[PDB]
């Protein structure tokens, strides 16, 4: 009962002993796999209650009993050490809103776990036994505040947290003090994405990516995810998307595909919009709005035409949803960008049109702003045409190439950069089978 | 909070302020160096102002940023610059880090110094600050009083001055057989 | 500091451990080919 619950923990500790032997390749991944099983048995009931006894007796075990705060008692310096830590790990784990509601109790306890006999000697020893998400994921909830007043001065705990995360960024010694790291950034990233301007993202960028291997693709993607939104208002789109194009499947999420990958996808949709591409939402119809795309579709729906009014209306309608996702800031650019997109297909087709037909479309829109509006267009390219008002003839270029250029061969170097792609990464995965034959 | 004022206080005059900037900054560098990492160009120039005394603040502050930037011979240099803002007994992983970081530098230096001269360490060529702090930790190593700890360093440290004294001192101290063996062990 | 001069130093070996091999690597590599001949 509580046994089998603990029996899992026992077996986990059994594998924690496999860590108490050495890394933990199993044990962590075990703990990871165990962290999956963490859902099943659970409660605290005699879980935490005998856990005290099962722990008994360590001080911090009794300290954690403050988190227990129940009727346990009963009966039951070395075998109790990292287990307790691993249970302090579970102590975190316990609290997911699993076995908890307000972690603000545990907020303090977080520190009062993290700080004491913890956050100290672990550099290579504890191998991301820290889950700073699980650390912060607590505060993540609390950041539903609002309430806290911030709180405090503003909001220094989260500040101190950033500093405390910095205190790991400190402790991130690149000794493999890594995995959790850019979550701390992802935090600070999304902390910028709370109120902030990431641009120390560049400084975050200055350090590193979550190097490298041992990190969950998730956070590695969730890295990119935020790392995209850097380039979002950094106004790099490709690379942002490239992050999404480094993000999505790719960190397998399916469970997290639901709420979370929409977010991802939500941003992804915005990209080609920023690039004016509007890929086929034909799938993005589905596993989507419902709760994610369709405003983007409405956007796309607009962005296909880009009728400012009709466009704006989307925003006008979905602004709050935009606002909810802070995608509002976007799309304001893309307004005329599609209007300009249409401009290209207004028949730039004729090697011109005269001024006032290409004005006519603006004589459908505005006048002699045309001059600007076309210069506004011709400015960025996005169309290649010419004019002179002296002629009043708006001269729309060929846009015609017999290519024979490196242009595709760029796209080959692309391919070529994948000529090794797994071709190399096979040799990467040649070791694992055959050198584990050597063991 | 966020460093924007301290970012602003930076260029603001009254080296008093700059102190209290740097002061307040120094304490909150740890987090906010990130924002501050862009102010380093001035901070550099700040360390180049003999007018403003405390700039060793900023130097070690920059060193904080530099670990936080992964810059070390940068950081070390400005930690070396500090001497005051810096101290060995000051305990941060960072401090412990930068020291240990600062340290290793000595070795090859000393070894490169050892290369040409084997009395190199009797001389000035290595930044004495390091050498000091080096030996100061060697002193701490002596106060650690497990001396292979010191020796294997001074082994690579090539400093018999350390070594022999470490022996000789320890010689009269205790470990009748060990002071013999400690040698043998080494 | 301490036990590493004992311990750490023993890893210089493990450095060489690599250095033993990639040498011997090309061996089989060539030992392949001139032998790859006659077969």
């Amino acid at each position: 009962m509580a046994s089998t619950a603990v029996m899992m923990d026992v077996d986990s500790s059994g594998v924690n002993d496999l860590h108490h032997s050495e890394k933990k390749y199993a044990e962590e991944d075990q703990v990871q796999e165990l962290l999956k099983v963490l859902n099943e048995i659970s409660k605290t009931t005699l879980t935490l209650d005998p856990r005290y006894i099962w722990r008994s007796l360590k001080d911090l075990s009794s300290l954690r009993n403050q988190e227990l705060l129940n009727a346990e008692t009963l009966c039951f310096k070395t075998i109790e050490v990292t287990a307790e830590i691993n249970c302090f790990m579970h102590l975190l784990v316990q609290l997911f809103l699993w076995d908890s509601k307000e972690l603000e109790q545990l907020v303090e306890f977080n520190r009062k776990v993290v700080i004491p006999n913890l956050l100290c000697y672990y550099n290579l020893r504890s191998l991301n036994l820290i889950n700073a998400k699980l650390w912060f994921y607590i505060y993540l909830s609390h950041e539903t505040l609002a309430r806290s007043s911030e709180e405090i001065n503003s909001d220094n705990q989260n500040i101190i947290l950033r500093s405390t995360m910095m205190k790991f960024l400190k402790i991130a010694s690149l000794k493999h003090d890594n995995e959790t790291k850019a979550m701390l950034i992802n935090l600070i990233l999304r902390d910028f994405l709370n109120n902030g301007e990431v641009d120390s993202a560049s400084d975050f960028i200055s350090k590193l990516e979550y190097p490298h291997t041992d990190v969950s693709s998730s956070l590695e993607a969730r890295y990119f995810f935020y790392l995209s939104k850097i380039n979002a208002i950094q106004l790099d789109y490709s690379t942002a998307n490239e992050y999404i194009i480094a993000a999505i499947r790719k960190a397998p999420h399916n469970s997290k595909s639901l709420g979370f990958l929409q977010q991802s996808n939500k941003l992804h949709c915005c990209i080609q919009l920023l690039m004016g591409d509007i890929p086929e939402l034909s799938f993005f119809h589905q596993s989507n709005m419902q709760k994610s795309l369709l405003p983007y579709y409405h956007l796309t729906k607009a962005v296909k035409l880009g009728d400012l009014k009709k466009f704006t209306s989307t925003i006008t309608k979905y602004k709050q949803l935009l606002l909810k996702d802070d995608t509002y800031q976007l799309c304001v650019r893309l307004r005329s960008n599609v209007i300009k997109t249409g401009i290209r297909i207004i028949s730039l087709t004729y090697k011109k049109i005269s001024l006032r037909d290409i004005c006519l479309k603006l004589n459908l829109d505005s006048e002699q702003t045309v001059e600007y509006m076309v210069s506004r267009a011709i400015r960025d390219g996005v169309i290649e045409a010419k004019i002179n008002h002296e002629d009043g003839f708006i001269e729309t270029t060929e846009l015609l190439n017999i290519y024979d250029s490196e242009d595709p061969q760029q796209v080959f170097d692309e391919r070529i950069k994948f000529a090794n792609q797994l071709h190399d990464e096979y040799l990467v995965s040649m070791r694992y089978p055959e050198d584990k034959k050597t063991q | 909070t966020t460093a924007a004022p301290l970012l602003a206080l930076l260029r603001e005059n009254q080296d008093s302020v700059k102190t209290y900037a740097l002061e307040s900054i120094n304490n909150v560098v740890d987090q906010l160096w990130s924002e501050i990492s862009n102010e380093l160009p001035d901070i550099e120039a700040l360390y180049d102002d003999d007018t403003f005394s405390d700039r060793e603040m900023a130097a070690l502050i920059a060193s904080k940023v530099y670990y936080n930037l992964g810059e070390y011979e940068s950081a070390v240099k400005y930690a070396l610059a500090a001497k005051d803002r810096f101290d060995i007994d000051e305990k941060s992983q960072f401090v412990e880090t930068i020291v240990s970081k600062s340290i290793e530098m000595y070795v090859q230096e000393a070894s490169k110094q050892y290369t040409k001269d084997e009395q190199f360490y009797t001389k000035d060529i290595i930044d004495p600050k390091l050498t000091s702090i080096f030996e100061r930790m060697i002193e701490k190593c002596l106060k650690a009083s497990e001396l292979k700890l010191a020796l294997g360093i001074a082994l690579e440290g090539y400093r018999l001055d350390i070594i022999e004294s470490a022996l000789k001192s320890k010689l009269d101290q205790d470990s009748t057989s060990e002071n013999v063996k400690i040698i043998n062990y080494l | 500091y301490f036990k590493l001069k004992k311990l750490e130093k023993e890893y210089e070996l493990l450095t060489l451990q690599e250095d033993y091999i990639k040498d011997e690597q090309r061996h089989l590599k060539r030992e392949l080919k001139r032998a790859q001949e006659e077969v």
């Binding site: 070791r431 | 020291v99 240990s100 340290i103 360093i153 | 890893y11």
Partner: peptide
């Protein structure tokens, strides 16, 4: 102190290039 501490992690990281050559061993 931690002076030589992480010095492991230098060669401790080297554990790999071994195994490449180890992969290579077979592979060769």
């Amino acid at each position: 102190e931690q002076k030589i501490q992480e010095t492991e992690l230098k060669i401790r990281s080297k554990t790999e290039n071994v195994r490449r050559l180890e992969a290579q061993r077979n592979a060769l």
